[PDB]
Paper text:
Acetylated lysine (Kac) in the N-terminal tail of H3 or H4 provides a binding scaffold for reader proteins such as those containing a bromodomain or Yaf9, ENL, [name], Taf14, and Sas5 ([name]) domain. Another Kac-binding domain, the [name] domain, consists of approximately 130 residues and forms an antiparallel β-sheet structure that can recognize and bind Kac and some acylated lysines. In humans, four [name] domains are present in four different proteins ([name], ENL, YEATS2, and GAS41). Human [name] domains bind to the acetylated N-terminal tail of histone H3; however, their Kac-binding preferences at the level of the nucleosome are unknown.
We determined the crystal structures of [name]-[name] complexed with the K5/K8- (1.95 Å resolution) and K8/K12- (2.00 Å resolution) diacetylated H4 peptides. The crystal forms of [name]-[name] in complex with K5/K8- and K8/K12-diacetylated peptides both belonged to the space group P1, and each asymmetric unit contained two [name]-[name] molecules (molecules A and B). Molecule A in complex with the H4K5ac/K8ac peptide (chain A) and molecules A and B in complex with two H4K8ac/K12ac peptides (chains A and B) recognized H4K8ac at the aromatic cage. The electron density of H4K5ac was detected in the H4K5ac/K8ac peptide complex structure, but the position of the side chain of unmodified H4K5 in the H4K8ac/K12ac peptide complex could not be determined because of low electron density. K5ac and K12ac were located outside the aromatic cage; Nε of H4K5ac hydrogen bonded with E57 (left) and the added acetyl group of H4K12ac hydrogen bonded with D103 via a water molecule (right). Outside this cage, the main chain of unmodified H4K12 in the H4K5ac/K8ac peptide complex also hydrogen bonded with D103 via two water molecules, whereas its side chain was oriented toward the solvent (left). The interaction modes of [name]-[name] with H4K8ac and with H3K9ac were the same: the aromatic cage of [name]-[name] hydrophobically interacted with the aromatic residues F28, H56, F59, Y78, and F81; and the amide and the carbonyl oxygen of the Kac side chain formed hydrogen bonds with the hydroxyl group of S58 and the backbone amide of Y78. On the other hand, the increase of K1/2 toward K8/K12-diacetylated NCPs was 1.3-fold, which is the lowest among the three multiacetylated NCPs. This result suggests that the E57 residue is important for the interaction with multiacetylated NCPs containing H4K5ac.
Residue numbers in the entry:
A (entry chain C): 4 to 12
B (entry chain A): 1 to 138
């Protein structure tokens, strides 16, 4: 769940 | 009866993202837009009741409902995420809706901007006459 936000494909 | 029916409809899911020239006061580095539409300007409102975009919990009012076209969300943010999209149908029979887990990915700064198109085909075996009629107007 947590820390699902990210950059890149 | 002797007769049987399979109706197929085309949906286009997609998103665009660009790095901002200046980030927002909240620290949002990207502007993005996500959408659901018919191919080649086809009017899916004939059979679509609403589209619900389930944004990440960090956004205010994260359940964004589009009862009419355009079915889209325009936002600013700092990172990509999986964005569940529910497409509700104008019917009183199953399936009432379909869900897609949409990959709302953002590129890094100094990379080309995102412009993604995802193609989905829905199949309805033996829909009701009323629902069949709505589907084939699109």
């Amino acid at each position: 769940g947590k820390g699902g936000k990210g950059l890149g494909k | 009866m002797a007769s049987s029916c399979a109706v197929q409809v085309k949906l286009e899911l997609g998103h665009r993202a660009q790095v901002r020239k200046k980030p927002t006061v909240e620290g949002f580095t990207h502007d993005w837009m996500v959408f659901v539409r018919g191919p080649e300007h086809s009017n899916i409102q004939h059979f679509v009741e609403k589209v619900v975009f389930h944004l990440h919990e960090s956004f205010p009012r994260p359940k964004r409902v589009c009862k009419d076209p355009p079915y889209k969300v325009e936002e600013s943010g700092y990172a990509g995420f999986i964005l569940p999209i529910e497409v509700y149908f104008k019917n009183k029979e199953e399936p009432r809706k379909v869900r897609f887990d949409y990959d709302l990915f953002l590129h890094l700064e100094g990379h080309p901007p995102v412009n993604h198109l995802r193609c989905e085909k829905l199949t309805f075996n033996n829909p009701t006459e009323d629902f069949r009629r709505k589907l084939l107007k699109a």
